[PDB]
Amino acid sequence: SMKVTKVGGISHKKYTSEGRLVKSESEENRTDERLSALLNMRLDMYIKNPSSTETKENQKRIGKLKKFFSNKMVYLKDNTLSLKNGKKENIDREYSETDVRDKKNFAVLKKIYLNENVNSEELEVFRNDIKKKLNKINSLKYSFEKNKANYQKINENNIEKVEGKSKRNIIYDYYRESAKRDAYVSNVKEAFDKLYKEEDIAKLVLEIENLTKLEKYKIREFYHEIIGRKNDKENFAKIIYEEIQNVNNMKELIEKVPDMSELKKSQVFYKYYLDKEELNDKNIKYAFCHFVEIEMSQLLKNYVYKRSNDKIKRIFEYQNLKKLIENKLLNKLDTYVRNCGKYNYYLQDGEIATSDFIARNRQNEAFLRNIIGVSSVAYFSLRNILETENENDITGRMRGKTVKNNKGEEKYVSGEVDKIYNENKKNEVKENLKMFYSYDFNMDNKNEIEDFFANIDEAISSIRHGIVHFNLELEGKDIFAFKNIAPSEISKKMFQNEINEKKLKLKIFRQLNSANVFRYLEKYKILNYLKRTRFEFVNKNIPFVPSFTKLYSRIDDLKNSLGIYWKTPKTNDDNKTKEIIDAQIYLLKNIYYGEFLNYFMSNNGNFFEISKEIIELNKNDFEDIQEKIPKEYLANIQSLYMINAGDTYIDFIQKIFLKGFMTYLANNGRLSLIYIGSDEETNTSLAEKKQEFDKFLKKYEQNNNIKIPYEINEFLREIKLGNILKYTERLNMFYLILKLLNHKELTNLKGSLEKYQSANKEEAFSDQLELINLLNLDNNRVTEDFELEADEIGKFLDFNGNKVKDNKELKKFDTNKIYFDGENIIKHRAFYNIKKYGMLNLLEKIADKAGYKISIEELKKYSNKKNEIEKNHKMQENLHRKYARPRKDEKFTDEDYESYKQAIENIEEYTHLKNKVEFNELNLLQGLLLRILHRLVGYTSIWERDLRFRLKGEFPENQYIEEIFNFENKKNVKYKGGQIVEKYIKFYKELHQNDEVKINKYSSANIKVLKQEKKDLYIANYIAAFNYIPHAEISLLEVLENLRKLLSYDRKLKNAVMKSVVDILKEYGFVATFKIGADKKIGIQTLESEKIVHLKNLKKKKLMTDRNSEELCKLVKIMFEYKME
RNA sequence: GACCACCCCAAAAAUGAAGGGGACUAAAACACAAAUCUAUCUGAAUAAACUCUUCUUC
RNA sequence: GGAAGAAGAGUUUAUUCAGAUAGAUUUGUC
């Protein structure tokens, strides 16, 4: 296989004139340039040792011969065989003597090995190998030329259609219409029947079925016989070409040669005549045999030739294969009319759909869907915050609605923000709101509150409405516009409150204190630091910068290596020493990421000058002297290092930074810090400081208004953070959502914007990313005190074979006191999160019917094993030292390994138990569900787009067709009311009232069946509206069953559903096996934990532990099959 | 009957449709393969600091 | 509105192992 793109940054892009290979993002045509490159013969190609069979000594001999010839090639620049070298070669190698390849070529190959002679005439051996390459490269350059933009828009002065000009597409248009679909299918079947006959096919399948390595030539050899290659080539090929010259028409050609094989005459029509003559029903038939052939060859190419073991019978049996190729050419045809719709929207009348235009749609749409997770997981929390009792969606109704009724002219409707009071839930919602947002809500002063919830709602919607329903003109950058929301007082103040200069500084102050910086540094020395260095709440990855902790770890050893100019902290007390070291690591950690990186990556750079010191010492103890910039350089260093193998790359890069950082410290006057611990005199002064500072901090966080003491302010005043976020309205509303977000949806949201920024050189989202990095700091952590109730906890407990409803029984259950201390419940982070996002009633049900509960026997194991995890962790810690960084003589005795194995195994058990006990396993499940759900909406998104695609493609004329997808029903003449589904059915029913025989399946009797079962279209409503919650009328397995039915129009989509589900489980740590029946109803056969590979590079057996407990895997299984009742 | 895709282009001589391409289209946006590095968050452990709760004993 | 001993939870910080997302480079593609 020749890889002609993605090497050299070349890509094939399509342009109106022609299709060309392009480089970078320039439009210059580099086809000839790149191909001319590949017309070389790589000399190893000549020798190989694939199998187990060879003796090692011989096998080593040949492996050797491989690497040597891998850097020499043969080309013909101008009728002369010639040689080239890829790379430098060792000046001296003892070649010695060392029937290895096909015989003819040997003479020159040995001489080449020993350097002996040009023997240019003797390079003619390889002439025939090249003219074959040259013919491949040639046929290719044409396969590139003919792949070109072929979709065009005609205004028509009236009509405004889009159509394709590919020869392929000229045949789609003919059958573009629904009416012609049945003829298009027969023509296919004619063609399949002409080429392929049951006896011969029945016998191919035997051969494919009976496959022996490289007996595949048997199948190829057989296929050519079926296709009569020998007849066409031997008999008709030359006559056809020359005669092709003699006549203009296909018709005129046929008269000249009337005994032309059917396939060889379809192939002819396609290349020469299809493009340019009127198509008649007689003419079009010619095109089909070529189309069906390609589909089989494509099947053979994909299945027999390259790659599952006996499924092949499924697609290759005569009766199946026939249907397969029919559906296929239908699927290909249906996606062409959809493409006509799509381009009809985006193209001015002149235009053609070039690769530049096409490419940006996929990228834009795809990004936008990632943001589907954000709105969905945020809605669900907004549902949690106010304990609504709507089976139905609550989007868009936080506020009371007063209407003119059919009678009496005025009436007022429930405001979900207005049930808060009607239902006497003010207390529960107050505490619920506080958990997400830190503000002292007044649940009187209702207007303030109603105006606030209406912020979270409208915020989430501004997103949801854009992504869930295809929006033609939505662009990536604007998803977080939050266009019509105007923040309310409660939101304005809180965002001002949280992103406050003082509060932010008090967070760096708190860090500094807990690092023991305030108890081991004099006030004046600190102020010198603060006037000098800035703080960032999170670091960024400059590309090549090694981790500080890795760097710090290696300080003592290197100074022996290089004149470090440092002294480690040492002291009488070990306990102080660790404390002091943290202070040193925290202060230093701060300069590196920040002040130094700026200087070191800086043009006014230490880095080039230092870098040679590392180089020079290494020579004393060969890396490049090419100037440029540090990231490219170091990159270049990577390449040299890799190519040799013989680790040493990390040291150079580690060594550059350590000496770079120190000399930086000494040079720019931070050096005093070595003596941070040092003097007992001063420390006694500072002994009460860390304690006293901590006492305040709680005081200030609890109050947030406390007068600040003078001693603290001196410090607060000289801290510098770098730029504070400007207040933005958009930022404030973005802030409201971020807090609603779950912990994984934040991490995924963040990686999504960073992808957008990396992908296109736009820093847009720069502000929004800053906020996340601030909030992501403690979003999961338990910010404030919260309360859970035993009856809520109880739901997952087996007390004497019953759930616990009572604070009093909770005592009987908890002999060991993990849940209850006897007056208040224990408040683990895990509990904290379950309250926020727990959908405990549903969770309660699923667990209940999966036999998941927590038992006393399990509690008594957790406490027993809790007593010994310190050891097992200390064990793992030290042992990993031995593996990773080992002493001069140390070995991993197998006993070391068994000891390790046992430790990690004891830890997984404790962890697995601990997670169940603490309700983390339930939190994991909660999120897995919301992800599966919200991922599914994304599918509804395509379908809702594909529909209006094929519509405008099918019926450009119909003005009304767009009405179906516009939710602004004032604006619609027809299909005035409803949802996309309902408007389409009305459209569909009218579309064929007149029918050969009654078309309509959407009868009122039938539609009623559909709506209840969530079958056909109606599944899209179940999915997009999140109706699965909270009842689970239908199963996830069922949903998947008819979501796929719903996407059966596009193959690629229909069989991507289960990939997105298998892959979403792997993220969460489950490996799933499903079975899909002849009935096509999904079931789960197994669910099991993904594994962790420990000690990845030991000659010993793979050691691993499961990611999730079998009890949990058993609970994800039932979740999927969980139906109501 | 998916996980185990899909669409486009190559047929005289170059019947090797035994070939190539695709952020172009799905996989919720940058070919896979392999190996490093890093940012962020999360789980499990330990140490120091502060805060709150529970228990036992005179 | 009494002392003195056990405990636990939360938060901050340094460190060890692991995962998930995302970013950077290298190597190579019968």
mmCIF file of C-alpha atoms in Angstrom, chain A residues 78-241:
data_model
loop_
_atom_site.group_PDB
_atom_site.id
_atom_site.type_symbol
_atom_site.label_atom_id
_atom_site.label_comp_id
_atom_site.label_asym_id
_atom_site.label_seq_id
_atom_site.Cartn_x
_atom_site.Cartn_y
_atom_site.Cartn_z
ATOM 1 C CA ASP A 78 16.117 9.596 -17.330
ATOM 2 C CA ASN A 79 16.539 6.080 -18.655
ATOM 3 C CA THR A 80 19.265 5.315 -16.163
ATOM 4 C CA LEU A 81 18.835 3.207 -13.069
ATOM 5 C CA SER A 82 20.143 5.135 -10.127
ATOM 6 C CA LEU A 83 20.551 5.040 -6.392
ATOM 7 C CA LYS A 84 19.833 7.341 -3.473
ATOM 8 C CA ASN A 85 20.295 7.343 0.247
ATOM 9 C CA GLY A 86 17.621 8.396 2.694
ATOM 10 C CA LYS A 87 19.963 9.255 5.552
ATOM 11 C CA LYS A 88 23.552 9.444 6.664
ATOM 12 C CA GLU A 89 25.058 6.029 7.302
ATOM 13 C CA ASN A 90 27.671 4.941 9.789
ATOM 14 C CA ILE A 91 30.963 5.550 8.116
ATOM 15 C CA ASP A 92 32.188 2.151 9.213
ATOM 16 C CA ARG A 93 30.394 -1.150 9.609
ATOM 17 C CA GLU A 94 32.058 -4.535 9.420
ATOM 18 C CA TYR A 95 30.010 -5.953 6.584
ATOM 19 C CA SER A 96 31.877 -9.250 6.156
ATOM 20 C CA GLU A 97 29.704 -11.713 4.180
ATOM 21 C CA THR A 98 25.951 -11.406 4.661
ATOM 22 C CA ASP A 99 20.237 -16.382 -1.406
ATOM 23 C CA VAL A 100 18.053 -13.869 0.425
ATOM 24 C CA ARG A 101 15.640 -12.779 -2.299
ATOM 25 C CA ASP A 102 14.390 -13.486 -5.795
ATOM 26 C CA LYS A 103 17.433 -14.547 -7.717
ATOM 27 C CA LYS A 104 17.852 -12.065 -10.518
ATOM 28 C CA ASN A 105 18.239 -9.021 -8.320
ATOM 29 C CA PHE A 106 20.985 -10.440 -6.109
ATOM 30 C CA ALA A 107 24.049 -9.436 -8.046
ATOM 31 C CA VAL A 108 23.645 -5.731 -7.531
ATOM 32 C CA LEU A 109 22.239 -6.035 -4.062
ATOM 33 C CA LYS A 110 25.390 -7.602 -2.587
ATOM 34 C CA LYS A 111 27.582 -5.062 -4.344
ATOM 35 C CA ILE A 112 25.381 -2.347 -2.942
ATOM 36 C CA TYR A 113 25.789 -3.879 0.486
ATOM 37 C CA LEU A 114 29.560 -3.709 0.204
ATOM 38 C CA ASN A 115 29.629 -0.313 -1.627
ATOM 39 C CA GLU A 116 31.370 -1.904 -4.535
ATOM 40 C CA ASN A 117 30.190 -0.269 -7.798
ATOM 41 C CA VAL A 118 27.722 1.867 -9.699
ATOM 42 C CA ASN A 119 26.913 -0.910 -12.130
ATOM 43 C CA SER A 120 24.331 1.492 -13.524
ATOM 44 C CA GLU A 121 23.518 -0.828 -16.352
ATOM 45 C CA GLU A 122 23.243 -3.414 -13.604
ATOM 46 C CA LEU A 123 20.520 -1.313 -11.995
ATOM 47 C CA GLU A 124 18.390 -2.230 -15.005
ATOM 48 C CA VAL A 125 17.254 -5.350 -13.165
ATOM 49 C CA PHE A 126 14.746 -3.161 -11.442
ATOM 50 C CA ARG A 127 13.436 -1.463 -14.584
ATOM 51 C CA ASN A 128 10.298 -3.564 -14.823
ATOM 52 C CA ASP A 129 9.422 -3.036 -11.172
ATOM 53 C CA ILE A 130 9.433 0.709 -11.766
ATOM 54 C CA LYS A 131 7.439 0.936 -15.006
ATOM 55 C CA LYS A 132 4.773 -0.784 -12.937
ATOM 56 C CA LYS A 133 5.007 1.876 -10.207
ATOM 57 C CA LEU A 134 5.054 4.496 -12.937
ATOM 58 C CA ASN A 135 1.813 3.040 -14.269
ATOM 59 C CA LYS A 136 0.203 2.942 -10.849
ATOM 60 C CA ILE A 137 1.306 6.510 -10.143
ATOM 61 C CA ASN A 138 -0.141 7.344 -13.528
ATOM 62 C CA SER A 139 -3.535 5.791 -13.145
ATOM 63 C CA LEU A 140 -3.636 7.414 -9.714
ATOM 64 C CA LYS A 141 -2.942 10.977 -10.867
ATOM 65 C CA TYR A 142 -6.094 10.498 -12.893
ATOM 66 C CA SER A 143 -8.141 9.182 -9.989
ATOM 67 C CA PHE A 144 -7.163 12.435 -8.310
ATOM 68 C CA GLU A 145 -7.886 14.607 -11.320
ATOM 69 C CA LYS A 146 -11.393 13.254 -11.753
ATOM 70 C CA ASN A 147 -12.319 13.620 -8.082
ATOM 71 C CA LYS A 148 -13.504 17.175 -8.187
ATOM 72 C CA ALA A 149 -16.328 19.344 -7.046
ATOM 73 C CA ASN A 150 -19.399 18.275 -8.965
ATOM 74 C CA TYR A 151 -22.402 19.692 -7.161
ATOM 75 C CA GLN A 152 -23.865 22.819 -8.660
ATOM 76 C CA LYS A 153 -26.753 25.209 -8.239
ATOM 77 C CA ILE A 154 -28.903 26.553 -11.030
ATOM 78 C CA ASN A 155 -31.114 29.539 -10.306
ATOM 79 C CA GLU A 156 -32.896 28.902 -13.594
ATOM 80 C CA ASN A 157 -34.244 32.456 -13.429
ATOM 81 C CA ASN A 158 -37.161 30.844 -11.616
ATOM 82 C CA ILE A 159 -36.499 27.375 -10.176
ATOM 83 C CA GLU A 160 -33.222 27.261 -8.147
ATOM 84 C CA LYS A 161 -32.286 23.511 -8.140
ATOM 85 C CA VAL A 162 -29.004 21.757 -7.202
ATOM 86 C CA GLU A 163 -27.584 18.840 -9.087
ATOM 87 C CA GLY A 164 -24.371 16.917 -9.447
ATOM 88 C CA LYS A 165 -22.308 16.663 -12.612
ATOM 89 C CA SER A 166 -20.399 13.475 -11.786
ATOM 90 C CA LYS A 167 -21.113 10.710 -14.216
ATOM 91 C CA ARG A 168 -22.182 8.877 -11.107
ATOM 92 C CA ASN A 169 -24.572 11.728 -10.320
ATOM 93 C CA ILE A 170 -25.965 12.124 -13.809
ATOM 94 C CA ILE A 171 -27.463 8.685 -13.165
ATOM 95 C CA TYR A 172 -28.755 9.620 -9.746
ATOM 96 C CA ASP A 173 -30.680 12.622 -11.104
ATOM 97 C CA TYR A 174 -32.443 10.448 -13.636
ATOM 98 C CA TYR A 175 -33.652 8.370 -10.639
ATOM 99 C CA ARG A 176 -33.769 11.309 -8.277
ATOM 100 C CA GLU A 177 -37.490 11.058 -8.073
ATOM 101 C CA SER A 178 -39.463 8.777 -5.820
ATOM 102 C CA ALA A 179 -41.479 7.612 -8.738
ATOM 103 C CA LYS A 180 -38.431 6.145 -10.445
ATOM 104 C CA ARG A 181 -37.131 4.344 -7.416
ATOM 105 C CA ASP A 182 -38.766 1.065 -8.377
ATOM 106 C CA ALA A 183 -37.273 1.056 -11.881
ATOM 107 C CA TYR A 184 -33.834 1.957 -10.464
ATOM 108 C CA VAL A 185 -34.097 -1.116 -8.271
ATOM 109 C CA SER A 186 -34.974 -3.436 -11.157
ATOM 110 C CA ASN A 187 -32.177 -2.115 -13.319
ATOM 111 C CA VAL A 188 -29.902 -3.013 -10.500
ATOM 112 C CA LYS A 189 -31.363 -6.479 -10.287
ATOM 113 C CA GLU A 190 -30.989 -6.929 -14.060
ATOM 114 C CA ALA A 191 -27.364 -5.993 -13.747
ATOM 115 C CA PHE A 192 -26.665 -8.189 -10.758
ATOM 116 C CA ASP A 193 -28.260 -11.101 -12.580
ATOM 117 C CA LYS A 194 -26.220 -10.544 -15.727
ATOM 118 C CA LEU A 195 -22.879 -10.502 -13.898
ATOM 119 C CA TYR A 196 -23.556 -12.946 -11.120
ATOM 120 C CA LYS A 197 -25.183 -16.351 -11.270
ATOM 121 C CA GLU A 198 -26.073 -18.591 -8.401
ATOM 122 C CA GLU A 199 -23.821 -21.513 -9.284
ATOM 123 C CA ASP A 200 -20.664 -19.456 -9.550
ATOM 124 C CA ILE A 201 -21.400 -17.287 -6.575
ATOM 125 C CA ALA A 202 -22.267 -20.349 -4.521
ATOM 126 C CA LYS A 203 -18.722 -21.483 -5.196
ATOM 127 C CA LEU A 204 -16.901 -18.238 -4.544
ATOM 128 C CA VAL A 205 -18.402 -18.388 -1.098
ATOM 129 C CA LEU A 206 -16.851 -21.779 -0.697
ATOM 130 C CA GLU A 207 -13.450 -20.364 -1.518
ATOM 131 C CA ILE A 208 -13.769 -17.344 0.719
ATOM 132 C CA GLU A 209 -15.195 -19.659 3.321
ATOM 133 C CA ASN A 210 -12.183 -21.866 2.914
ATOM 134 C CA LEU A 211 -9.346 -19.386 3.201
ATOM 135 C CA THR A 212 -5.720 -20.305 3.648
ATOM 136 C CA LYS A 213 -3.055 -17.657 3.960
ATOM 137 C CA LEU A 214 -2.357 -16.316 0.507
ATOM 138 C CA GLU A 215 -4.643 -18.739 -1.235
ATOM 139 C CA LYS A 216 -6.621 -15.542 -1.844
ATOM 140 C CA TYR A 217 -5.055 -15.460 -5.270
ATOM 141 C CA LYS A 218 -7.479 -18.306 -5.779
ATOM 142 C CA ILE A 219 -10.437 -16.037 -5.144
ATOM 143 C CA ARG A 220 -9.131 -13.175 -7.263
ATOM 144 C CA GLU A 221 -8.246 -15.706 -9.898
ATOM 145 C CA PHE A 222 -11.784 -17.032 -9.698
ATOM 146 C CA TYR A 223 -13.451 -13.637 -9.669
ATOM 147 C CA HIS A 224 -11.784 -12.618 -12.922
ATOM 148 C CA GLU A 225 -13.221 -15.729 -14.512
ATOM 149 C CA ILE A 226 -16.719 -14.897 -13.366
ATOM 150 C CA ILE A 227 -16.256 -11.404 -14.703
ATOM 151 C CA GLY A 228 -14.691 -12.730 -17.867
ATOM 152 C CA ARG A 229 -11.560 -10.625 -17.704
ATOM 153 C CA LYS A 230 -9.752 -12.960 -20.075
ATOM 154 C CA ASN A 231 -12.417 -12.406 -22.731
ATOM 155 C CA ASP A 232 -12.416 -8.617 -22.576
ATOM 156 C CA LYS A 233 -8.617 -8.218 -22.498
ATOM 157 C CA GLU A 234 -7.806 -10.957 -24.961
ATOM 158 C CA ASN A 235 -10.587 -10.355 -27.392
ATOM 159 C CA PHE A 236 -12.354 -7.039 -27.457
ATOM 160 C CA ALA A 237 -10.053 -4.543 -25.753
ATOM 161 C CA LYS A 238 -7.972 -3.064 -28.616
ATOM 162 C CA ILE A 239 -10.786 -3.157 -31.154
ATOM 163 C CA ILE A 240 -12.982 -1.249 -28.761
ATOM 164 C CA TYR A 241 -10.462 1.468 -28.199
#
